[PDB]
Structure 1
């Protein structure tokens, strides 16, 4: 039979379709699910990235600082920790179902605090003072489909693999109908909650409505990026079910950021290493070299990061970048390779803070060819003349031609005009566009300096500056020929 089209790359997973409501013939037929060999959590890829180390790498004096300042390795979050821990501990011990809403800006320790809470709760459950529970982590930005959370959570509960709809009625049956004595408490971290927001808002309603069921024993800890998300994007039902209590994670102050960086720099700052002068490898306790990172540098970086974001990721990255600048200068000075006091100074911290601030756009426009600068000058002249933010390309052509033909008496124009309109050549006729006109137009379009509308007539097509006008003016009058005229 001849097909009208073919699907030759269909990949379908082995997911059954029958939900949990039809496993057993009755409510009384369900056993205690905590004793089943597949329920409640009862990797093979870690050896694939193993190789044979046949070299000896050199770890220098600043290597331990850069490795230790990473995000992989709880001082300033102790009230939020106490709130989340006490609510979750009361919900576990009473066999209740509870929503905990946590919101905040990036890098302020939300995921870290919730993970530390569930580690202390699992340790407390290991001492047999609260009942045992299953911890499920669902990240909305780590899902392909938003409904895959239905796939994930049920797979964490039962060990079955079903399609998302059947998983959704399975979770509904499990949370409402199964009694508490046959169940185990489940703590779910929903992280990046906004990523799980759809048009129907069914996932939001289901996940927060299961926390209103008497038999559920479900604790949902939802992490948001804003506090006004349930009012702005969600309905009144979901906003009512989330609750009035909402824990806000403020951005870190510079005392808190300094405490975080000093906590990572305990045992390394004001310490001595044994450093080989032949290769460069350094050992924590041949020369005895003292390593310092100054507290004034850390406080400058902490104050800047705390005013801009209050982000622990940025504070740690600025400190690591300063140490890498110092370590690059160190390897340049001593000639070390990749096989008495060394200090991360305040100047490295200022360089790390200024390298994301130095405005390469003006430098890029300064280092362009004469035709691109002439294009930008003509466009700026038209914006000065007729006062419009969008200029037609034919007007730019005509005003470039006027700029060449009026200030001819400039010696540079007498040098450049034959190049511009004939490419320095007899037997090439005079050209309506300049040489490399489309080249510099496409080059300024690639950089994001220009916006061009989508028209097929090249003369009436409009061009707008996407960058600010003042930086284009200062780049243009940096040029000695264009500022002369």
Structure 2
């Protein structure tokens, strides 16, 4: 079906061959390592960007192009190694992960680091140029900063033949996280990937659905505009498109339902569907806060206000245990803040949501 085809094309893992939306950046990268591949000299580059900008996809596409060029005997052969920071149980273990990738040897972290140092500092046999990719750089931090120092200092050696690209989310990392000598080593080589403009998102969506007439232009434009006005991320845009297809299986209304169901908060409806006693408890808390003006109140005054409200409403007299049970149930779903494990009558209570939201939920 056409809807099935659209669902298949819009999947996240369905990477396109090449989209010129980042071609400029691509071209820049396509030069740098290329020069480093032609002069037989290593280098280092730091790329910082918000998630969802296609940094990993761009790097992988560049690596694919370089591999294809090498297969066509235009670039000297090279060894590619990729490591992910957050896929590692311990930081130092990365030394093993690199080593086993280049020699297959199993060794302890200290011994693996020593062997890597010996191989990258001593004039050994002429090896292929090494292209090292490290993902999630900020998660390799250490109080001693030895791993990061070695990673960004080893390509400085001529014998290393090492090219390193560090992908991260924070552009401040080389300044407030990285010390002085290593800061200048990555200095002047920072690539920043700006979020996609609504035109870029529209181009990406149109490229996803080429030769396929399933969505109207207004819905796609509104989805792209909303994404640009919210986060400017392609992943959530694809998710919204998929959910809109799902709803259409059941117009712009579909996209609106998707966006306001997958982004909006559910606190208001949870408060609305609460029980009567919970509503009385919330009203008592609000009344006590208005009387006092403080954002922290002991459980005793709240209980007194609740008793007064129950007397006003004519409800039966509530016991302390019932009120404490209701308080615990409310605190379980993170609507309030309390530590009732030991203290019972002297519990500080703080609202986890804005007061105006509570008012708008309780007016109805």
Shorter-chain TM range is over 0.9
Paired with 1:209 and 1:85, the residues of 2 have a C-alpha distance of 23
Alignment of 1:214-233 (within 5 A): 214-233=158-177
Any conservation in 2 of the 1:455–1:461 contact (CA below 8 Å)?
Answer: no
SS at match of 1:391: coil
Secondary structure of 1:237 counterpart: helix
Q: For structure 2, list consecutive stretches of 5 or more residues without a partner in the other structure.
A: none
Choose which of 248, 251, 255 in structure 2 pairs with 1:349: 255
Counterpart in the other structure of 1:256:
200
Q: Within 5 A, what are the aligned runs for 1:182-221? A: 182-221=126-165
> Please, which of 439, 464, 469 is the counterpart of residue 355 of structure 2?
469
**Residues of 1 paired with 2:3 and 2:86: CA distance?**
35
1:37-88 CA-partner distances (Å, limit 9, x unpaired): xxxxxxxxxxxxxxxxxxxxxxx44122112111211221111111111100
Aligned-pair CA distance for 1:196? 1.0
Aligned to 2:237: 315
**What is the rounded CA distance, in whole Å, between the counterparts of 2:263 and 2:169 in structure 1?**
26
- SS of 1:349's equivalent? helix
Are 1:170 and 2:56 an aligned pair? no
Q: Equivalents in 1 of 2:8, 2:87: separation in Å?
A: 26
Q: Distance in 1 between matches of 2:73 and 2:41?
A: 18
What's the TM-score once normalised by structure 1's chain length? 0.72
Match of 1:383 among 289, 295, 305: 289
Q: Is the 8 A contact 1:394 1:458 kept in 2?
A: no
Matched-pair contact (CA < 8 Å) for 1:84–1:100? no
**Residue among 66, 71, 75 paired with 1:121:** 66
Q: Which residue matches 1:286?
A: none
Q: CA deviation at 1:454?
A: 5.8
Q: What is the Cα deviation at residue 250 of structure 1?
A: 0.6
Residue 97 in 1 paired to residue 36 in 2? no
Q: 3-state SS of the aligned residue for 2:262? A: coil
Q: Which residue of structure 2 lines up, in the alignment, with residue 62 of structure 1?
A: 3
Higher relative contact order (CA 8 A, sep 6+): 2
Give the alignment partner of residue 71 of structure 1, picking from 4, 12, 25. 12
Contact 1:210–1:218 (Cα < 8 Å) also in 2 = yes
Q: Is the 8 A contact 2:299 2:347 kept in 1?
A: yes
The question of whether the paired residues in 2 share the 8 Å contact of 1:108 and 1:311 is answered with yes
Counterparts in 2 of 1:324 and 1:455: CA distance versus 1, 3 Å: closer
CA distance in 2, matches of 1:454, 1:174: 59
Which aligned segments of 4 or more residues in structure 1 are displaced greater than 6 angstroms? none
| Structure 1 match to 2:188 | 244
How high is the TM-score relative to the length of structure 2?
0.95
Are residues 173 and 455 of structure 1, via their aligned partners in 2, closer, same or farther at CA, if it must alter by over 3 Å?
same
Q: Deviations over 1:319-340 (max 9, x none)?
A: 111111112x1xxxxxxxxxxx
1:405-434 deviation per Cα after TM superposition (whole angstroms, max 9, x unaligned): 3x2xxxxx33x31xx44xxxxxxxxx4x26
Counterpart of 1:368 in structure 2 is 274
Structure 2 CA distance, aligned partners of 1:441 and 1:399? Answer: 14
1:374 deviates by 1.0
Which residue of 2 is the match for residue 458 of structure 1? 344
Which of 109, 113, 118 does residue 54 from structure 2 map onto?
A: 109
How many corresponding residue pairs? 360
Q: Which residue in the other structure is 2:307 paired with?
A: 401
Q: Distance in 2 between matches of 1:298 and 1:126?
A: 40
C-alpha RMSD of the superposition: 1.6
Partner Cα separation in structure 2 for residue 457 and residue 350 of structure 1: 46
Q: 1:443 to 1:183 in 2, by over 3 A?
A: same
Larger radius of gyration: 1
- CA positional deviation for 1:356: 2.9
DSSP-derived class of the 1:101 partner: strand
- 1:225 CA displacement: 0.3
Q: Give unpaired runs (5+ residues) of structure 1.
A: 1-59, 271-291, 330-344, 408-412, 422-430, 479-485
